[PDB]
Ligand binder design. Structure first.
Ligand SMILES: [Zn+2]
Ligand SMILES: [Zn+2]
Ligand SMILES: [Zn+2]
Ligand SMILES: [Zn+2]
Ligand SMILES: [Zn+2]
Ligand SMILES: [Zn+2]
Lengths: 270, 279, 260, 279, 279, 279
């Protein structure tokens, strides 16, 4: 089936008395990949659309045209995709392109038809998609995981030994506002980003080491923080006014997506 | 003489128990033009910046560079100007251009220096500015009030007899996401946008001015269609209408207002019309 | 076909956090005229009773006795009626009196039987009634629309060109507490009333079927609003302003009481 | 040295979450008698005025004229007076009448000048006044304490052995809407309105005084029968009980209180008794 | 049936805006004696367990072993019993002891099996039990009502004429932290603990019973001395009083109540007594 | 410079709408060791007293007698001490005993005088004290760090590699209701109590210190298992965990913490393990 939900924006003052269940409602997407479904969220935090498409038997396309006041999905929007699942393919205005595990794609404004397929149905592909408003059309570009540039950072003393792969980066590509990346924490480290008011971020956590892994994501004003506890393959959206960092009981990975009006804190928490 | 304040976005459920003072603070810009000053707002409703610059003696320029993460103000933004005051002038990267009353200007992305001047100091120009994030450079275009096309609408039976001027309209011009217009109500009429609407892919800012006599007040309605609130406006004040909110107002006398809109599309037939069954 | 509900009084700080649904409940009488029914409100704002009686086949009378601790309705109360519907009649302790459209009546304390009938059932009379505590008997009096003094007021620039008709006015009549009038807004005007020692407004005669009236209440610096359909009523406590604006013109009946 | 404060009416739902401090503010008059002052409350509970006048050197009169939309205080109001203090005298449009301790007076509508004096300055008179809106003039009547009819009731088992004095009673005199009485609790018993009640067409105001010893306290109960609250009282304080509320009290020792009532009917049977089933 | 509910502790500031229904839930045990049942509360106010045991046909035992992290109920706890019902008996490690009406028993730490029985089924025994954490074992002691020491106090002037019985009193017996007593009010008096107090290193639980006639009600007051609340009680109900709280009551008629106390000391001198100036 | 503050208990429902600032106030002791000072808190969770003693020039004694209703501090209480600072000494009923870093002491009920000294003033000793109510006197015992039994646990995959030292342990010594231990996390590990739990018959207090670098912070979690909150801690701060609450923490680097436990059972077996499904 197809489903897209709408979550509004808030101020720090609004959430200050939200309980645990409300925080989950306004800031957490509890399900992203369901076999045969397209699950999306529309957040008024800069009007990002994010979610997953996991085709099994029929090929799937994001069919929203009139819900956005445009003739087709990408008439005034750009799209970035990373596949965290099995062998699949996306075919763009008729031209098919095979996407391996952890391969990525950027599709620019004005692309008329984008269709997601899975090769193996019992081990389907999991396309994590992020779309943002766009005013200029830029060229489409496949980002093989082989050629994604790896940057090791962190250390063991600070429990943040990870590897950052830059996928959709302004120093390597032209896009309108959208930036995506992918961070793998090495075993024995579980800590990420440890406020920009001119942009915002959304994190999608996955690849939990063992099934009993949980992740604590922190959000809020630096001196008034809250947390949201995450299972595997869930995503949390961070407003501009909020810090964004997390801890896990073990290591994990996550895809981050960023937008705002440009493309470029301290230690006093609570 | 330069000030920019920040207002956040909200959900309908958030404002549901705001008292009057909270409502005014979160949605109303109480002062826009002060002689010699630049007064602006940053709303996280689609990151619009709006406000006024009113040059008297020295020219003024909106010098936001690093507060926005860019090298100059308009490095990733477009700009629209309407002059509601006296004879003034704008100089754009060295090129001077005279702006009489009700003249308007569109400035495209990448324009590096925009400097506002007034010709007569005792009757200064009142530049209402509206800026929105932009990704494509479109050409600058002065919108003379003479050549603004007038469309009369409304009637006396419904108290909405007015004349609409199109200033920055998608059917006349290329812009990234920004639209502006100017609506003047005739005497005896005081109702705007009355069959009311909500569009989910755009948002609007109303700036009320040209009040008839000094005791005029305007009641601006906002909120979900079945849970509406109002804010009482004096002359030269502005209201931010989030997408989930209706936007309409009535005055004790006639008035005028400039509306500025932005969002992810610019098509006008993307609205949900609100039937007259509301609250 | 008889109903009387009870609404309490509030302070300004009490209503400050009412949502619209609560504001509607506490301050708005959503239904007044239903054919064959008597619909009333009892407000503890000076203990006014207001409502409607719309007789169709059988005659109607407001038979409150022990609910007010008295032997008959008007034992300690005065009553005012305006008929906004069809040809009707009032029978007062046996004497029948014909009431045309927009005719009015004052009924004083001690009157034991007041009985409402309509001539044509298909076009029934719409009796808007208002009762207030009373201590002195004043004579009953028919108020024909012909004899009500009209005062034109307002202008077009301020959108409040109207005509005020006085029916129960202290300068023309004796009553204990009660004052009633009738205001008609001219086409093209919609603003009305643009006091601490209370008023109740009943709006009707909406020009077109999509007409609405926004009624404002609250302390002058902290105002709220209530949206009204045709033939609905709002009660204004002494501490509140009284204002309304409509998408078109309309008419409304006002009833007032207090200490002067 | 004159004061009148204004208290509004509430519903049961409104007060349900009042703390102790708000409950006192909304329902309690903490000071009533001050030498040389007139202290009043105006409650929108049937628009009753109650308070005290205690003259020492200069004689006092309640000069509310335009504050009530009338030419003089009693142009549309009734007045009931009881003196709980020293020997004094009140003069009515020129006629002087000496008022001893526990004497009472009823003054009808239209009386233009009422002046309260104290005879001994060091032991002054305490005039507790209660005024209620009035439409008919009824004759003035001195109610000497000698000639007031007493009725003893209650028993020792139920701690409510008392004696009731009727002062302004519909069965002994005509008044517009006002009724007053006076209850003295016997030693060893302290409980008033013991199976309590709610009349929806009348409201009552109780003023407690004559505490046995200086540390006596009275706990006055008010509220809906299933949601009750209480207010802790010192000597010579007053509490206002809405129509929707029960009204009863118990004290640590004996005391006395005068009660004043009004509404739309002067009938004593209209009340709803409450079986002892109440949270 | 066996039933034990758990109530947490609160601060003064927490209850300040409780409505009536909440106050009942957090502080009142509405049912204690039901034939054939064991009804208990565990309050995080010093971890007191109190309730009733009412055997009718089969004998009853409080078999909390692993629910408390111990091998048997009294492994780290002491127990106090007063019988307010018919002739019964309790069996202690096989040893039976007859308990008449109003007899009391103390059972010390380490006692492994305590079994409650009733002689007459149609008139069953009502064992009010209070168990408290204990670290030192003291000998078990039957406290007969005949041999209970009586102390009359109070008078009729203050409506508190009563007689106090000592049951578990640190001056006649050794216990770990538990003290129980029994107070009966005379006819014509209905006030207990009236010059009231707050001891900060101890807390009390009051259980009201023996109401005079079936329409008796008792108003128990609790809270910070300046922010007082009340709870209306029926017969055979109990209230839990936190350390920060005053505790007292008034009844429409006379009554009786058992009080149980624990804390970190057993000195009756440690109390911050409360003068009548402060609610 | 003696200071003891008093904190009350709360129910899970009470804290649910606390902001961060209330949570810090209700649950966190932000300063414990100040040179020359005794800083303690009194919590109504089982009436634990904990805090710090840091003598510089003068020896220090906890001089609480009438504040607790007893003749000397430990008249009805036991005491646990761990030294986290420089070389010091404590003298117990006259007998002096030198206490080096990480040494510990148990002082039982009835000990009359306990006097703290530090040897080097510029590097004073840090006596972290925890006191608990007691009913039986047990012998005093020095718990040297040399003879403290070390138990290594955890792994690197789960980031909880630590060493648990048992100081006051039911399997090595008799105490009334009190356990203290010590946990040192190795470099690269930060999670403590990650197989998490709640015990309903006792409660724990965590005091975190020895942060690796000055920018270390520890996030301590508390609340019902499905409704968790967190508190951010600096070095040498303490958090109080009610029985209904989970207690576990994670840091940006490694650290150490002392835990103290008390309740009605000393048994480790009695915990409800909370699985990894929690919010
Ligand atoms: Zn960031
Ligand atoms: Zn619009
Ligand atoms: Zn008015
Ligand atoms: Zn009464
Ligand atoms: Zn006590
Ligand atoms: Zn634990």
């Amino acid at each position: 089936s197809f489903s897209m939900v709408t979550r509004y924006a808030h101020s720090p003052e609004d959430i200050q008395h939200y309980d645990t269940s409300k925080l989950r409602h306004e800031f957490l997407m509890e399900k992203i990949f369901n076999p045969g479904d397209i699950l999306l969220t529309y957040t008024y935090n800069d009007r990002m659309i994010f979610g997953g498409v996991m085709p099994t038997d029929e090929p799937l396309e994001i069919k929203l045209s009139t819900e956005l006041g445009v003739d087709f999905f990408l008439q005034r929007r750009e799209l970035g995709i990373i596949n965290i699942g099995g062998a699949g393919a996306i075919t763009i205005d008729g031209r098919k392109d095979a996407m391996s595990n952890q391969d990525g794609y950027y599709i620019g404004m004005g692309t008329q038809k984008v269709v997601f397929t899975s090769e193996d149905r019992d081990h389907p592909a999991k396309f994590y998609v992020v779309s943002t408003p766009a005013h200029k059309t830029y060229p489409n570009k496949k980002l093989p995981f082989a050629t994604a540039l790896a940057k090791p950072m962190g250390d063991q003393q600070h429990l943040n030994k990870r590897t950052i792969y830059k996928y959709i980066d302004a120093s390597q590509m032209d896009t309108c506002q959208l930036q995506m990346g992918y961070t793998v924490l090495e075993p024995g480290s579980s800590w990420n980003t440890m406020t920009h008011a001119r942009r915002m971020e959304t994190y999608m956590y996955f690849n939990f080491a063992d099934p009993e892994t949980r992740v604590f994501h922190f959000l809020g004003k630096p001196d008034e923080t809250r947390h949201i506890t995450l299972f595997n393959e869930q995503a949390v959206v961070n407003p501009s006014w909020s810090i964004h960092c997390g801890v896990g009981t073990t290591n994990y990975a996550f895809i981050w997506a960023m937008c705002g009006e440009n493309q470029t804190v301290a230690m006093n928490e609570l």
